[PDB]
Every structure is written in structure tokens, then in C-alpha cells.
Design a binder for these strands. Structure first.
Ligand SMILES: Nc1nc2c(ncn2[C@H]2C[C@H](O)[C@@H](COP(=O)(O)CP(=O)(O)OP(=O)(O)O)O2)c(=O)[nH]1
Ligand SMILES: [Cl-]
Ligand SMILES: [Cl-]
Ligand SMILES: [Mg+2]
Ligand SMILES: [Mn+2]
Ligand SMILES: [Mn+2]
Ligand SMILES: [Mn+2]
Ligand code: NA
Ligand code: NA
Length: 312
DNA sequence: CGGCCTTACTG
DNA sequence: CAGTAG
DNA sequence: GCCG
């Protein structure tokens, strides 16, 4: 639905993002969750006592939601270090995180021009810098579809049986997608092998793939651009998995990230372990049979949720 | 007090 | 391994 | 940050 407390979240997001880019990950996680809670809430919040009651919101956070409701402002925001805007600028480079951002800042850099001419850049960071603007824009769902079909087409040319599905935000039904996450497998349980590498060659020779960021056993993180004019470069992620891990692979890749974390966390409390490979029992333990996503929720004693309902 | 998901690539 | 990322 |  819609957020009934944007006047609150909007202010907290600024602070959460500040801590994030500065390296205070755990505190930033607290705000991130506090924020997620406020958003998905039946109606607007009105009181302190009303705030604390909400899971994910404690005394310190409740206080802040108050200052906002009463002072209409968050004094804390008035003291965010002047290095934050630059740290955010830097970490928006794919391949560069909080540590690299702080280092560059310590060395005197303040702008991308500074980074381009003087900073030391890993191969990935150079690619991220080159597509800085493109990677900041979420693409129209329709374009996400075009990309999925492109990979599926190139893949099925090797084996018409190969199953290709765009997961991530796409499968969750979002209007726009930051990238395209394509899962590839095969019902025969063995044909998925021996393609990955050749598939990337096809897409590469075809001019579709323009830059590679990470190439591994079953995962690929790269960059693509549809043919024709008016096209931006888009991030593309592909994972090839054995059909026996389909349900878990699909569940993982569909996300959301926070949804995955919660689900894995729950599994953990029940003496189980959840990954993109399988759902098991604490130690490794035994692999529980999971033919479908629903089997995962069931085994975890959770009511099934549609992909569109997995925001967190 | 102390975890806060879990796995994988890069160098 | 640390850093970054899905 | 929050929570067990
Ligand atoms: N367990 C886990 N799963 C994750 C994590 N990050 C991502 N995933 C899973 C869940 C996530 O759905 C999937 C794709 O990750 P992206 O493509 O990076 C983010 P998307 O949701 O696709 O939305 P977009 O911003 O692209 O429009 O990997 C993480 O930290 N942990
Ligand atoms: Cl985190
Ligand atoms: Cl360009
Ligand atoms: Mg995505
Ligand atoms: Mn992705
Ligand atoms: Mn471009
Ligand atoms: Mn694996
Ligand atoms: Na609380
Ligand atoms: Na980055």
C-alpha cells in the first residue's frame, strides 16, 4: 500500500544513510529496520508509547519519532558530517564501498573528477565509474522484460529446455528495476551444466554484454545494453543452478534481501539453515526436500507469501 | 553482553 | 584474509 | 540503532 509516516521516515532515512556511508553498519541496520516498520504500518503513528510498542522501535528511536512529530524537525540531521555527501558520491561507484570511500576522502578527493584523475581504481570500480549515471537509474519494467528475453533467447539456442526466469525486483512485480537478475536451470537436472561460459560468449559476440564485473562457478555479474539508440547500460546478473536446488535458488534470487535475511534468521532460530542451495538442519545437518517455494515456508511454519509480498 | 543471513568472487 | 556484492 |  502507501506509507502513512513518510514525514518521519524521510527524516530518518537521511540519518540511516549517513551512518551507512560512514561505516556504522549495525546502527544503520537499526534505522533501516525501524524505517521499514514505520512504512508498512496500518495507520500514521501518533505517540511515543505508541511508537515503542512497535517491534523494531525502541526508546532511542521512539524519542526521535517524537522530536519529528513535535519539533517538526530532527536536530540530529543538523550535525551530519560534511563528508557524508562525498562518501555517498564515492560509494555509488559499483565496486567501491564504505572503506574505499573513506580512504579516498582521507586522501583529499572530493569529486568524481578527483577519482578519475588521481585515485587508484580496481577493474570493477573503473567500470562502475564509467557507467556512474546509468547505474543510478532504475529501468522501466518493460525494458527489464526485453533483457530477460534476450538472455533466454541466447540460452535456449543451446538447449530449448533451459528454463530462464528474471527474479529479483522484477519477479516481485516492481514498476522499475535497478537491474535484471536471471536464474537459469533445467528440469532434466543435468543440462544446466556446460552452458554458462558459452552463453556469455554468445551474448558477448552479439554485442549485448559490454563489461564483466564478476565471473564465478554459477554466478555472473556484468553489464549489458539493448541494441539501437536511446539505450542506457544496465547491470545484469545471471546464476545457473542445478534443478535440485531450484526452489531455494528461486526463493533466494527473488528476495527481497531483507526478506531473505528474516527468513534465514527464522530458520536459524528453529535449528535450521537456509541458503540458495537448500534448507537444512543445524550442525552440517540434513537437507530437507524442497520441490517448491511453498515447501520452504511450510517447513519453516510460515504462511506462504507471493513474490509481490516479499518486501521485508 | 553480543548477534544483527549466508555464500561467493576479487586481489 | 578484507572488501564488496547478490 | 534493536532485540533476545
Ligand atoms: N541473503 C541475501 N540475499 C540477497 C542480498 N542482496 C540481494 N539478495 C537477493 C535478494 C534480491 O532480490 C536478489 C537480487 O539482488 P539485487 O538485484 O541486488 C536487488 P533487487 O531486489 O533485485 O532489486 P533491484 O534494486 O535490483 O531492483 O538477491 C543479501 O545481502 N543477502
Ligand atoms: Cl548489514
Ligand atoms: Cl556510455
Ligand atoms: Mg535486482
Ligand atoms: Mn542483481
Ligand atoms: Mn551508457
Ligand atoms: Mn553455490
Ligand atoms: Na519495541
Ligand atoms: Na558501491
Amino acid at each position: 500500500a502507501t506509507n502513512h509516516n513518510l514525514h518521519i521516515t524521510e527524516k530518518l532515512e537521511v540519518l540511516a544513510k549517513a551512518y551507512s556511508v560512514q561505516g556504522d553498519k549495525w546502527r544503520a541496520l537499526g534505522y533501516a529496520k525501524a524505517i521499514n516498520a514505520l512504512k508498512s504500518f496500518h495507520k500514521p503513528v501518533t505517540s511515543y508509547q505508541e511508537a515503542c510498542s512497535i517491534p523494531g522501535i525502541g526508546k532511542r528511536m521512539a524519542e526521535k519519532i517524537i522530536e519529528i512529530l513535535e519539533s517538526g524537525h530532527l536536530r540530529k540531521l543538523d550535525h551530519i558530517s560534511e563528508s557524508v555527501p562525498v562518501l555517498e558520491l564515492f560509494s555509488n561507484i559499483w565496486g567501491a564501498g564504505t572503506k574505499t570511500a573513506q580512504m579516498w576522502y582521507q586522501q583529499g578527493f572530493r569529486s568524481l573528477e578527483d577519482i578519475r584523475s588521481q585515485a587508484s581504481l580496481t577493474t570493477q570500480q573503473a567500470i562502475g565509474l564509467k557507467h556512474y549515471s546509468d547505474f543510478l537509474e532504475r529501468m522501466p519494467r518493460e525494458e527489464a522484460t526485453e533483457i530477460e528475453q534476450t538472455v533466454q533467447k541466447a540460452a535456449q539456442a543451446f538447449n530449448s529446455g533451459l528454463l530462464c526466469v528474471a527474479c529479483g525486483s522484477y519477479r516481485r512485480g516492481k514498476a522499475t528495476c535497478g537491474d535484471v537478475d536471471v536464474l537459469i536451470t533445467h528440469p532434466d537436472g543435468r543440462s544446466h551444466r556446460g552452458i554458462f561460459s558459452r552463453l556469455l560468449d554468445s551474448l558477448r559476440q552479439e554485442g549485448f554484454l559490454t563489461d564483466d564485473l564478476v565471473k564465478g562457478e554459477t554466478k555472473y555479474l556484468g553489464v549489458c545494453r539493448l541494441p539501437g539508440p536511446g539505450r542506457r547500460h544496465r547491470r545484469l546478473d545471471i546464476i545457473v543452478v542445478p534443478y535440485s536446488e531450484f526452489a531455494c535458488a528461486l526463493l533466494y534470487f527473488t528476495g527481497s534481501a531483507h526478506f531473505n535475511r528474516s527468513m534465514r534468521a527464522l530458520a536459524k532460530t528453529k535449528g535450521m539453515s537456509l541458503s540458495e542451495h537448500a534448507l537444512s538442519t543445524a550442525v552440517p545437518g540434513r537437507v530437507l526436500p524442497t520441490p517448491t517455494e511453498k515447501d520452504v515456508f511450510r517447513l519453516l511454519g510460515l504462511p506462504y507469501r507471493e513474490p509481490a509480498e516479499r518486501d521485508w
